[PDB]
């Protein structure tokens, strides 16, 4: 009956941002204040709310979105951003109430030869809508010649790998990100607090 936050922050691997992972957290009594005790989070921004004002007011939905991106893209995890991540991978609504936690995962997610197992979407014919997920892999038409499923010049495969190395700089190091969404919809209550 406990709220299992341990699984969301202690995991061995995270999702790729293009195929980002969403987990519903329902039917749970939670303690939220003992999570902020970890002052090792390099990023911690909450929208429509202050970081210590949610122990009595409850909301019906709690989603744990999580993925990995590199240091220079973490700025895009916010309502109203642009860039490959914000527009082609993970987009937050403008009226988004929730929190954005990020921390540097270099000792975990990189290896000496490079760790090319996390991917992102480089190209897309239009921006995502908020919380849309695109897992398709069709050839991207970057020119006036139609690509016709075949790869070639101006006909690119839309997904790339991040190259994560321990000697990379901060803008190029892996950052694990978790977005908590507290939606204002109506349904029987699921999530409690301290």
């Amino acid at each position, epitope marked *: 009956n406990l709220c299992p936050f341990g699984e969301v922050f202690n995991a061995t691997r995270f999702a790729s941002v293009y195929a980002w992972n969403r987990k519903r957290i329902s039917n749970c009594v939670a303690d939220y204040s003992v999570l902020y005790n970890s002052a090792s989070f390099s990023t911690f921004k909450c929208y429509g709310v202050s970081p210590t004002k949610l122990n009595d007011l409850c909301f019906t939905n709690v989603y744990a979105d999580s993925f990995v991106i590199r240091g220079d893209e973490v700025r895009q995890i916010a309502p109203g951003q642009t860039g490959k991540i914000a527009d082609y991978n993970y987009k937050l609504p403008d009226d988004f109430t929730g929190c954005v936690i990020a921390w540097n995962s270099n000792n975990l997610d990189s290896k000496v030869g490079g760790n*090319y197992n996390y991917r992102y979407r480089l190209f897309r014919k239009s921006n995502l809508k908020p919380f849309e997920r695109d897992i398709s892999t069709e050839i991207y038409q970057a020119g006036s010649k139609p690509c016709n499923g075949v*790869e070639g010049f101006n006909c690119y495969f839309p997904l790339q790998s991040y190259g994560f190395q321990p000697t990379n700089g901060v803008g190029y190091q892996p950052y694990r990100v978790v977005v908590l969404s507290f939606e204002l919809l109506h349904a029987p209550a699921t999530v409690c607090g301290p």
Partner: nanobody
Amino acid sequence: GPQVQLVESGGNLVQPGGSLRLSCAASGGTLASFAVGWFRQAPGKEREGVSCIDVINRANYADSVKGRFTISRDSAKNTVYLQMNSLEPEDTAVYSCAAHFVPPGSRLRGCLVNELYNYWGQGTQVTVSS
């Protein structure tokens, strides 16, 4: 996979004037982020690059094969193909695959100007004989 491996398949015994398509499967990352080249070493001779392709999908070829060989990219299968036409007996070699990563600030640079690659395959042998 902790490391990028490259496996070549398709090696066969074929006849002079034959054709053959070699493949280079990859695991560990998106091969569409790596520049890939093909090399051969005939019996007793030194390794030579024959063809390569970069992340913008432009090909380069050696003169011993220019007009006969075609390098091609199938990234839904995470592979690079090498279509070899008009095989003559002197194409008998072990055909190896090789790749290196292209980071974002270098996506326009070309290939077989990187004859040094960080990841190699073991090769699949092609024998051209009567």
